[PDB]
Structure formats: structure tokens, C-alpha cells
């Protein structure tokens, strides 16, 4: 489990920053996104032009232009990011939690941690010589 | 785009064709979109570096050559192998932990371990209950297929005739000269070629040698320098001229 | 056995080069990042303004050109901006202290000699010297 | 784990207070920020001067002028702070959690705490 190389560590932290961008854009996109629309008409000096329109109709043409003539990629950018970064999390997470080769790794790290742990390998690694150990680490090494 | 141009079928309801429409948020989505793809190209670029190591320097037995070249470097030469690519990932973690694994794996090392298991798992009451026999105090690893001699053997000086059929001990510990009562030695079905200064110990100790059923190669040559031997037992020298 | 482990440590470390070079590169990019940002941020503080004027291309849709524009929040961004860079300059001064410690006395071998002079004090004199820079960090904790 | 010097401790507290200001400005900047604009026109006494505008024209010139004629630093100040303080926290945390030198540290503090615990060296140190 602590066998992962460095680039898979970068994959984890870049992954969680990536989904943090996703949840930021999704939240902001829900509560603050709108569109402002008003018609182009032509295609004591300065006075304000006036339209005979209404707050009603502004909200209506807001919804019509916002649904129709706006790009779906700008509509659904955080959802593509969110779903798509879960593809990446499913890559590394699913590769490691594949069942049978995960059993290979679990068995492997169990004998690996004991293989770090054995002080007889400290002894036998450390060196016609003698030296008498005790019993049960012999059994453990058996 | 920040500022889009809308033109829809609304004119019977509001009476206008074209709508200048500002989207107040596209600059924010634009900058974090560019920040997003910047994050992805850094991400997948490192993934390409993983692939470049996958095709550049990674095989199925390359770490096995690191084991055995490391073992020739580590003075315990002949080490077997178990799968290298998972071992390659821990080779990228540290070769120190690779060194722990191979040094445990060598059969000379675990041979020494089970030899020590023999050394603390033959006890004084065992050979104590194997002491006195036909004429004298005679001990048997004879017909017992033991892999090594116990070290409590040279504990108990009461022994006089030792019986050592079927044992792979090429070496005897030098502390065997503590057995000053031992003078008759049975060394058959074995190849004890001690290579220790204990031969001078038994140069002035013993008088009887038994080399039964021993073939042409398995006659320990350096052993017969002890010039106080008096009787010799050479059954099974199936020898031509 | 722990003495054998220390003897193993004495072998495999080989005076710890990668943790020194890694630590040195990460603290030096931290310092130059600090200098870079305090440059442009002090260059942009006065560009925060409460009340700005506006002259855009909106004449055809409204009929006007210039707009008095009050931003109701710039005083709040201004006070936590100046408060912010006060926090940053305190942080970067600490970064300078670490870099001056690096350049002043800490080396590959300086705590090697602390072992040797401290062993001349502790009167078990002839002691060898495992790796100093990590030991300098513990020398920063305590000589105990 | 407790091999960190004291100045990295103050680095940690400066880091978390720093991004606490960042998330404060980010939250406040999203949910409350707007701009108020109105035209300069000339360039029984007091009456109300009046314009001829509608509500969303006013909202439109808010959006257009807010995007165009305002400094990006004044816009994205908490985001530059938030991203930039992640660079600092990533530096110190990166050095501690680079893999192979983390194996060096984990290995060393392992044997070092054993050296702290050894009662013979307590005794032989006491003599």
C-alpha cells in the first residue's frame, strides 16, 4: 500500500485539486450563473434610450437565449470535469482494487513487511563464525 | 465567449429579432478552463514519463539481474528469483528493501538458519538418553539423515565412539576437541572435509576411523593427516587401478 | 543488533546528499517566489480603487459614454490586502532566516565536528560521524 | 514527525491563517460583489434629476463595465492568494513527503527513537 511510486503520488494530489476545481465550478455555476440580454434595435445631448419592455420579458428572453444560443460546453464544463476526473480516480483506484492481483499485492506486502522485520536477516546480513539465537524467531523464519 | 449575439423566434411575444447578450461569467470559466488544461498537460505529461520508463528500462527479469549482480556484489552469490516488475516498483522505492528481500531469499542463508534450528533443537536430555551403547559411550547420527551436527554434541565429554552415517556436514566445529573421551569415529555416508584447525586437535586425539560405503570422490583427503590413527575401516572402495 | 542497525545506517547513508539538495532547492524556490510576489502585489495595491470611471462602447444600446462606477467593496479588499502583505513579509523574513542559517554555519560536516567536540566534552572521545544535516535538524531540537 | 524546526511551525500557522483570509475573500467576493455605475451626462431649488433607463440596461452596463474597465488584480485577488499559498504549503509538505527521502526520514527516526529508548545508554551515559 505504501509501495506506490512518486508519480502516482502526483496523480493523487493533482486528482484532488482537479475535483476541487470541479466542485467549485459546479457550485458557482448553480448559484450565480445567469445571462443578461437586451435587443439590438437599429441593426440635453445624451439622453437614455428607452424600450417598451418589461422585467417579465427580460427574464423570458434570458431563459430563451440562455437555453438555446449558448454553447453546451460552457453550460456543462464542471460536469465534464467532474465526471472525467472520476475516470482518472477509477483508473488508479480500480487498478489497485482489482480482486485477484490485489490479493497478490496484499500477500506480497505481508511477507515483505515481515522480511523487513526479521532481525535474523539483520544478523545474517550483518555477517567460520558462531553465535546462538533463541527459539521462536527460528520458527518465524521457518 | 463573454459577449454572445442571440437571434430567436420571440418576435410575436416581444417583438425583437436580435439580442445583444452578455454572459457575466465566461472570463472566470475561461481562466480556470485554461488552468484546468494546464493541470492536465502536466498530469498526463508525467504519465508519459511513466510510459517512457516502461519502454526504456523495464523488463521481466531485469531486476533479477539486479538481484544476482547485487548478490555477487553482496557476497551471497546464488539467489533465486520472484517476479521482478513488482520488485521494480520497490526498486524505485529503494534498493535497500530490495537488498533485504534477496538476502532473505538465498538458500545458503536459510540453510544456516535451519542449521541453527538444529543447534538449539537438539537438547542435552536427548543425547543424554542416547549415550551408552555396545561396548562404550556411542552416539548415533548414524542412519538418522540429520542435516547437521548439534553443538550440544561437544558439550558432553562422556562420549567415546561417534557414529555419523548420512549427514551433509562437510565441516565440524573446532570446539569438538572438548570431547576428550572421543577416540573412535564413524564417518560413513558423509563427506566431512572440515577445513579448520581442529584437525590438529584430533591429530593428537583419536585412533579409529570408519569410512563405510563411501565412493571414489567422497574420500576426505586432508583428514588423513592425523598420525595417531591406529585402525582404519575402508569398506566400499569400489576402485580400479 | 541496534548497533548493527546503526552500522547499517553508517553504511547506506553515504552522507545524505539527496535530502540536502532537495531541501536546498525547495527553500530557494520558496524565497524567490516570495520576492516575486511582493514585487507585483505592491505594484498593484493602489490599482485597487473605490470609485472608477467608465468609457465604453455602449452608445448604440444605451446612448451614453461615461459612467461613474462605485465599487462598494474595495476598502475591504484594501484593508485585508495591506494586512495580507504584512503577513507575507513576516513570512518571507522567516524564509531569509532559514536561508542565512543554511549559508552561515550548517554544512555537510559541521555537526560531524559537533560530535567530535561534544565527544571531547563527554569524554568518550573517538567517535565517528553519521550524517550531520539531518542531525543539524536535531541539533536545532536539542543536543540531548 | 517532530523533526520539524520551529520556523516551519510558524510557516504552518502563517499558511493556515493566510488561506483563511483567502477563503474569506473568496466567499465574500462571490456572493456579495457587484459594481454600481451610472452615467455622467453633462460632460424649489433641489429637484430629482432623472435618466431614461430600464432596470436591465443598468444591469447590463454593470456587467460590461465590471468586466472591462476594472483591474483583474482587484477581481481575482483571493484566487491569486489561494493558489499562491497552496504553492507555499506544497513546498514544505512536498519536501517532507517526497517518497525516497521520506524513506530516509522514516528509517532514521525509527532507529533514532530506539536510541532515545535504550536504557543501557541511559546507564552507560550516566556513567
UniProtKB/Swiss-Prot annotation, chain B:
Post-translational modification: N-glycosylated.
TM ranges: 28-52
Positions annotated as LRR repeat: 110-133, 134-156, 158-179, 180-203, 204-226
Stretches of the chain found on the membrane's Extracellular side: 1-27
Location within or outside the cell: Cell membrane; Lysosome membrane
Source organism superkingdom: Eukaryota
Tissue-level expression: Expressed in brain, kidney, ovary, lung, liver, heart, and fetal brain and liver. Found at high levels in bone marrow; lower levels are detected in peripheral blood cells. Expressed on T-cells as well as on B-lineage cells.
Function: Essential component of the volume-regulated anion channel (VRAC, also named VSOAC channel), an anion channel required to maintain a constant cell volume in response to extracellular or intracellular osmotic changes. The VRAC channel conducts iodide better than chloride and can also conduct organic osmolytes like taurine. Mediates efflux of amino acids, such as aspartate and glutamate, in response to osmotic stress. LRRC8A and LRRC8D are required for the uptake of the drug cisplatin.
Disease: Agammaglobulinemia 5, autosomal dominant: A primary immunodeficiency characterized by profoundly low or absent serum antibodies and low or absent circulating B-cells due to an early block of B-cell development. Affected individuals develop severe infections in the first years of life.
Annotated family: Belongs to the LRRC8 family.
Domain notes: The volume-regulated anion channel (VRAC) channel forms a trimer of dimers, with symmetry mismatch between the pore-forming domain and the cytosolic LRR repeats, a topology similar to gap junction proteins. The di-leucine motif is required for lysosomal localization.
Protein name (record): Volume-regulated anion channel subunit LRRC8A
Residues of the full protein shown: 290 to 530 of 810
Curated annotation (Swiss-Prot), chain C:
Bilayer-spanning residue ranges: 24-45, 76-100
Post-translational modification: N-glycosylated.
Domain of life: Eukaryota
Residue ranges that the UniProt entry lists as topological domain Extracellular: 46-75
Tissue-specific expression: Expressed in brain, kidney, ovary, lung, liver, heart, and fetal brain and liver. Found at high levels in bone marrow; lower levels are detected in peripheral blood cells. Expressed on T-cells as well as on B-lineage cells.
Record localization: Cell membrane; Lysosome membrane
Disease with which this protein is associated in UniProt: Agammaglobulinemia 5, autosomal dominant: A primary immunodeficiency characterized by profoundly low or absent serum antibodies and low or absent circulating B-cells due to an early block of B-cell development. Affected individuals develop severe infections in the first years of life.
Domain statement: The volume-regulated anion channel (VRAC) channel forms a trimer of dimers, with symmetry mismatch between the pore-forming domain and the cytosolic LRR repeats, a topology similar to gap junction proteins. The di-leucine motif is required for lysosomal localization.
Family to which this protein belongs: Belongs to the LRRC8 family.
Oligomer and partners: Heterohexamer; oligomerizes with other LRRC8 proteins (LRRC8B, LRRC8C, LRRC8D and/or LRRC8E) to form a heterohexamer. Can form homohexamers in vitro, but these have lower conductance than heterohexamers. In vivo, the subunit composition may depend primarily on expression levels, and heterooligomeric channels containing various proportions of the different LRRC8 proteins may coexist. Interact with GRB2. Interacts with NOX4; this interaction prevents the ubiquitin-mediated degradation of LRRC8A.
Function in brief: Essential component of the volume-regulated anion channel (VRAC, also named VSOAC channel), an anion channel required to maintain a constant cell volume in response to extracellular or intracellular osmotic changes. The VRAC channel conducts iodide better than chloride and can also conduct organic osmolytes like taurine. Mediates efflux of amino acids, such as aspartate and glutamate, in response to osmotic stress. LRRC8A and LRRC8D are required for the uptake of the drug cisplatin.
Identification of the protein by name: Volume-regulated anion channel subunit LRRC8A
Originating gene: LRRC8A
Amino acid at each position: 500500500r505504501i509501495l506506490k511510486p512518486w508519480w502516482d503520488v502526483f496523480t493523487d494530489y493533482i486528482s484532488i485539486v482537479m475535483l476541487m476545481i470541479a466542485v467549485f465550478g459546479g457550485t458557482l455555476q448553480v448559484t450565480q450563473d445567469k445571462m443578461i440580454c437586451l435587443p439590438c434595435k437599429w441593426v440635453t445631448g445624451p439622453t437614455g434610450i428607452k424600450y417598451d419592455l418589461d422585467r417579465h420579458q427580460y427574464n423570458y428572453v434570458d431563459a430563451v437565449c440562455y437555453e438555446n444560443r449558448l454553447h453546451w460546453f460552457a453550460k456543462y464544463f464542471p460536469y465534464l470535469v467532474l465526471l472525467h476526473t472520476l475516470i482518472f480516480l477509477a483508473c488508479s483506484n480500480f487498478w489497485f482494487k482489482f480482486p485477484r492481483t490485489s490479493s497478490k499485492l496484499e500477500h506480497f506486502v505481508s511477507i515483505l513487511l515481515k522480511c523487513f522485520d526479521s532481525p535474523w536477516t539483520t544478523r545474517a546480513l550483518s555477517e567460520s563464525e558462531t553465535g546462538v539465537l533463541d527459539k521462536k524467531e527460528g520458527e518465524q523464519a521457518k | 465567449k463573454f459577449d454572445v449575439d442571440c437571434t430567436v423566434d420571440i418576435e410575436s411575444l416581444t417583438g425583437y429579432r436580435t439580442y445583444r447578450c452578455a454572459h457575466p461569467l465566461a472570463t472566470l470559466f475561461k481562466i480556470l478552463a485554461s488552468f484546468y488544461i494546464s493541470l492536465v498537460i502536466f498530469y498526463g505529461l508525467i504519465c508519459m514519463y511513466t510510459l517512457w520508463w516502461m519502454l526504456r528500462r523495464s523488463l521481466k527479469k531485469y531486476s533479477f539481474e539486479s538481484i544476482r549482480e547485487e548478490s555477487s556484489y553482496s557476497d551471497i552469490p546464488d539467489v533465486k528469483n520472484d517476479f521482478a516488475f513488482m520488485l521494480h516498483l520497490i526498486d524505485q522505492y529503494d534498493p535497500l528493501y530490495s537488498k533485504r528481500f534477496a538476502v532473505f531469499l538465498s538458500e545458503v542463508s536459510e540453510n544456516k538458519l535451519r542449521q541453527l534450528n538444529l543447534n538449539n533443537e537438539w537438547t542435552l536430555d536427548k543425547l543424554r538418553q542416547r549415550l551408552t551403547k555396545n561396548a562404550q559411550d556411542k552416539l548415533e547420527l548414524h542412519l538418522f539423515m540429520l542435516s547437521g551436527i548439534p553443538d550440544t554434541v561437544f558439550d558432553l565429554v562422556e562420549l567415546e565412539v561417534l557414529k555419523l552415517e548420512l549427514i551433509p556436514d562437510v565441516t565440524i566445529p573446532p570446539s569438538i576437541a572438548q570431547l576428550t573421551g572421543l577416540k573412535e569415529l564413524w564417518l560413513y555416508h558423509t563427506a566431512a572435509k572440515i577445513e579448520a584447525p581442529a584437525l590438529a586437535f584430533l591429530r593428537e586425539n583419536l585412533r579409529a576411523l570408519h569410512i563405510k560405503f563411501t565412493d571414489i570422490k567422497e574420500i576426505p583427503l586432508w583428514i588423513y593427516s592425523l598420525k595417531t590413527l591406529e585402525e582404519l575401516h575402508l569398506t566400499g572402495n569400489l576402485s580400479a587401478e | 543488533a541496534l548497533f548493527e542497525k546503526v552500522k547499517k545506517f553508517r553504511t547506506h547513508v553515504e552522507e545524505g546528499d539527496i535530502v540536502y539538495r532537495l531541501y536546498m532547492r525547495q527553500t530557494i524556490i520558496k524565497v524567490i517566489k516570495f520576492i516575486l510576489i511582493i514585487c507585483y502585489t505592491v505594484y498593484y495595491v493602489h490599482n485597487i480603487k473605490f470609485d472608477v470611471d467608465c468609457t465604453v462602447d455602449i452608445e448604440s444600446l444605451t446612448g451614453y459614454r461615461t459612467y461613474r462606477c462605485a465599487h462598494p467593496l474595495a476598502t475591504l479588499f484594501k484593508i485585508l490586502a495591506s494586512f495580507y502583505i504584512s503577513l507575507v513579509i513576516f513570512y518571507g523574513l522567516i524564509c531569509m532566516y532559514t536561508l542565512w542559517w543554511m549559508l552561515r554555519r550548517s554544512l555537510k560536516k559541521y555537526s560531524f565536528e559537533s560530535i567530535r567536540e561534544e565527544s571531547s566534552y563527554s569524554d568518550i572521545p573517538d567517535v565517528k560521524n553519521d550524517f550531520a544535516f539531518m542531525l543539524h535538524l536535531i541539533d536545532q531540537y536539542d543536543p540531548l
